[model samples]
Target: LTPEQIIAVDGAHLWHPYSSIGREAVSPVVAVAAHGAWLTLIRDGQPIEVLDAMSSWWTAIHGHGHPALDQALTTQLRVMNHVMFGGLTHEPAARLAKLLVDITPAGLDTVFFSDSGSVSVEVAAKMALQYWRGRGLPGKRRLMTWRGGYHGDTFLAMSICDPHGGMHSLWTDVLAAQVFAPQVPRDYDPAYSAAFEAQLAQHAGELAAVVVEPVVQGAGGMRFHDPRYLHDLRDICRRYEVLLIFDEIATGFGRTGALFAADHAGVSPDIMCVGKALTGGYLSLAATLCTADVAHTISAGAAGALMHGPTFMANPLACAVSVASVELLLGQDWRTRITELAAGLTAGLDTARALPAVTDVRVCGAIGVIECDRPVDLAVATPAALDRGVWLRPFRNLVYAMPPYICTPAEITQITSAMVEVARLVGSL
Candidate 1:
């Protein structure tokens, strides 16, 4: 279909995600195809090759249409597309599970596969609740998470997000009530650390686990926190006997220049969630990994088995592609790519510091942010980025980039330039 016809049909009937159903919808760009770091988008009736700066929301680290990822999915379809995980098992799921157990922080031996990042978060929360129940501490059912963080949009996951500022704030009254700590800052301060610990201690008895987005928080806000803070959190959780869960869905797969952000602190959590890049952006897949202590105790408890199981759990296609994605990433020097992207972003975004509309500029690994004094007017800022030949998704006051690791230096410049331009546009409005 032509771009106009496609959008007309979409606007008339299709309800867009996270947008109002009745209100006039923002005409989304039609991405016809993608390869490497570029997206072929139909804008104003003509197709243009635009640099994909957001990596399709931090999923396509190896870039779109990766040969290995393609081959994996295609090859797996010949054998099986999917199989019920209840009584049946497949090599793809088993192989991916072993890869996760071996690669994630030590002692996270058991894996639970799910369909998306949000589902993984749901699994993590359930594990925390059941683990405590298994240990005869069912009263310890509440979850504690830091402020200025995002897990997912699911009910339980929504409860842990920033109460006032996050996208899910409207449903706070209906969501599960989880304890929240203060916002974690980039610098580790003793005063702040103690305050967080106090919150944990105060609610320890009712808390099953203290969940956090270690090293960097994505979505809730593009914020980076000190790894030492995670060290502090680990010790405090240990002292209080509350399990610690690291939501590595965004920070996993070398996005933070470490295989997992938890590596920055060199501390392992009792539970971990990984997704987004699991299949190299080819499909929606996620996983919840738990330590043997958590797993065995829950197994021995009243339930005798993990209570929750996703219908499409351990999907063969997702698992097969994930195995290939992991293998491909491991085969290459991903760290070097992360380093190069970091350097490019840092140098390019530094220019935004001079812009009057820019409040802050930060870059870590493949992530870059140009924070404005106020929430960016996406209607204006988005097209501004496109005009500069780059695609960015700006939310609230943040105009950020999470370019694919395979992006060239030239593409990085285009992305950063567009980010800076968007900052200026946001400032003027």
Candidate 2:
């Protein structure tokens, strides 16, 4: 029962996503415990604390093992563990639903609970399709999204992701053919907007909805676009009669310094998907919220019911903790916390500009990214980062950091150093 032994057994019997089983690259580390922003890992039969810079893939917004999150899960455990959400609901789910509506952009009143960020995207697409079909417009069944966006790993979700460049490319033959708009720039493009409007108008008849990541495209491409694009998109979608969906899974819960990414544009979508940081990263939970118009349209259809249901639709434990996490997040001045982190990231990541290999270092809210001239060699960068007292996950051509709100100023400095060093080590080779 040593860390080496645990990793050895994992090598023999596990298959990690986006990794080769027999590779000798930066192997996964053994994280035994996490407190605040530090993760205690067992290496060489000893414990070492490394700062988690990625917020454990954007889930641990309040950092790890917080008292409030812990109490929420434990308290709900004593009350009720699990229950079927069909025709019956509990206090936890009900309260979480109310909080989601009240906090998110106005008009997203109906909440549909699912298990993971990816599955929630599936539910969003289903609602769009059902809403359009139920509205006597069965021809509008496909989804349209801009290029270089990542949605989820599920079938319908993957279909709308960047087909040629994203991780879902291999599933191309099976992935449903979706409308991929031209890639956009961070700055507003007047020409692009005019063309995009025309394009949406041309493709409006067959599209059920236009999906986007709002302000930040997290996975696949860590890019930030003009917030005004969202307001323009809302206007265009309204004109084209196409539903608009904002995938706020990665950008939700004040990670982007707003209650929701859509808040940046002061516009609400017809449908929105939220996950990742819900429950403060305790359990798997996701919810797709929609406007009453969409809900009522679906309800008035011939089927009279949405044709989807999961076994653990609203698990009491997850709902309970999600309620706690939401209250815990909103109770504090989350904007100020994110602003401080954003300042730390801005100052820290600027050092990477000295390196010639780094093409761009961008910071938006609490998210920081360093884009290299070419794809980074994770074999060198990952372990190098661990050796420097930080755990980082680098992908493609970017080394990014999204530290939790509870991270100290000292930890932010360490995270940026390790991140820059990781890029340096790989770029040097």
Candidate 3:
């Protein structure tokens, strides 16, 4: 369809995520294709290429139209599109499981596949509750998470998100209440760490698990905390006999300097969830991996199986592409690329820090953020970035970029320069 036709259909029929309806709605760019670090959108009857600075919502780590990933998906479809995971198993699923076990943090040997990041979070929560129940500690059913954390939008996931910035305030009264510790200390201060420990100690009896976003908290706010906080969390959770769960959905697979953010602290969680970049942004797939102990305890429980299962669980196509994506990431030595990207982003965004409207400028691994004192009026900033040949989706007060690792040095410079311009534009407003 032409851009106008697509826009009309989207405006008339589509219910976009985190967007308004009717007259108040914002029409996003009509992207026709994506390749490398560029997205093709129609503008004035011409195809304009804009750098995908958000990495397609933090997925597409390898960029788009990757030949190996495409070949993997096509080959897998020739053999099998999908089969019910309940009583069936396939080569792609088995191989992906083995690959995940080989690559994730130590002791995370068991993998449970889910359809999306949110569902994976829901699975993690359920696993924590069930593990405690199986061990005859049913009283320890509540969960604990920190402030300024964003897990996902599923019911159980939403319950543990930072209460104020979780974006689900309308449903707060109806959601299940969970324990929340103080926000992870930004500077790794001893007093703040003590406060977090005290919260855990105080609620040790009632908590089944302590979930965290590990290193960098995405969504709730583009916030980066010291890795020492994760290390501290590990020790505290262990001391309290509460399971530690890391939501690496956004930080996994080299997005952070480490392959997994947990590596930054050298601490392993009892349960870990990963997605977003899992399949190179080709499909919706996620996984929740746990230690064998957690899996064994839950399996020996009254239910004898993890309580939740999606029909498309262990989907062959997603699994096949994921295996290819992992292989592709590993083959490229993504760590070095990420380090280079981080340096470029840090250098390029330095100017934004001096802007009067910008409150903070942070860069971790390949992630860069220019936070303003006031929430960016997207109505103004969205088109500003586009006009500069970049695509950025600013949320709240953050103008951030998580460009694909495959992006060249020039592309990285272009993205950050556009971000600097965006901050300036929003500040002027």
Candidate 4:
């Protein structure tokens, strides 16, 4: 179909997330192909390439059309595309499970395959609550998280997300009223840390688990905090006897310089959710990993099993690609690549630091964020970025780039250049 025809059908029949339909609708860029870190768009009857600065919402860690990932998927298709994970088993699923156990922080030995990141959060919540239930402490069923955090869009995930900043406040009345602590900023003030600990202490009796986006919070904001906060959280959760959960769906797989953000603190959580980059952006796959203790507790609970399971659990094609993706990550010099990208991002974004509207410039591993004093006007910035051969999705007061790890120094610099240019243009407005 022609680009216009596709856009027409999308407008008439499709509904997109976080988008308005009709006159206020936000038109999508028509992307016909993607390779490396760029997407090809059909614009004005011409093909224009735009560097994907956000890694397709931070999924394409290895970049699009990776040979290793492509070959893995194709080879798996010849054997079996998919099968009911129930009453069946496959090598891909088993192998990926073992890899997860070996790679993730130690003691997270059990794996629960999920279809997407949201469902993985759902499964984690279920496990936490069921774990408490198994121990005969059913009253300890509430989940706690900080104010500036985002887990996912599922009901339970939403409940624990930042109620006001998580963009789910419209449904707050209907949503579960999960406990929210104050955010832990990059500069750890003792008072803030003390208050956070006090709140958890007060709610400990009723709290089933404390879930967080360790080291960095993604969607709620591209905010990074000191790893010491994670260390403190680990100590606090232990003191309160509350289970700890880390939603590393975005921070896992070398995105944060370390393999997992928790590794920065040299700590591990009782439960962890990993996705987005699991298949190297080749497929939708996520896994909820837990310690054997948590798994055993759920097994011995009233349900005698995980209370939830998706029909597409442990999909072979996704598992195969994830296995290959993990292999690629481990086999390559990913740490060096991320380090170089971080340097490029830091240097490029440093230019925005002096801009009048800029409030902050922060770079963590391959992630670079330019925060303005006010919310960016995407209506102006989006076009400005596309015109400059870059695609960026700036939201709130943040213009960030999470380029693929494989991005060359020039590509990284190009992404940051576009980011600075867009931020400068939009901030002036």
Best by lDDT: 3
Error of 3 at 121 (Å): 0.6
User: Can you write out model 4's per-residue Cα lDDT over 63-140, one digit (the tens) per residue?
Assistant: 899998999999999999999988899999999999999989989999999999999999998899999999999999
TM-score of each: 0.98, 0.98, 0.98, 0.98
RMSD of each: 1.3, 1.2, 1.2, 1.2
**Candidate 1, residue 281: CA error in Å?**
0.7
Q: How close to the true structure is residue 334 of candidate 3, measured as C-alpha lDDT?
A: 85
Q: Model 2: per-residue lDDT, tens digit, 226-258?
A: 998998999999998999999999999998888
> Please, what is the whole-model Cα lDDT of each candidate in the order they appear?
0.89, 0.89, 0.91, 0.90
Q: Candidate 4: what lDDT?
A: 0.90
Cα lDDT tens digits for candidate 3, 134-235 = 999998989998899988887888888888987557885788889988877678887777888898799898899999999999988978889898888888
Q: TM-score of the candidate numbered 1?
A: 0.98
Give every collision pair in model 1: 375-396
lDDT string, candidate 1, 1-429, tens digits: 888888778887887767865585367788899999899999878889999898998899889998888999999999999989989999999899999999999999999999998999988988999888988889999999888989888888888889876645678478888898888888879998899888888888999989899899998888998899999999999999999999999999999989999998899999999999888898999999998888998899998988888899999999999999999988899899899989999999898999988888998888998888997887898789889999988888899999988888888988998888888777687
Q: Cα lDDT for residue 83, model 4?
A: 93
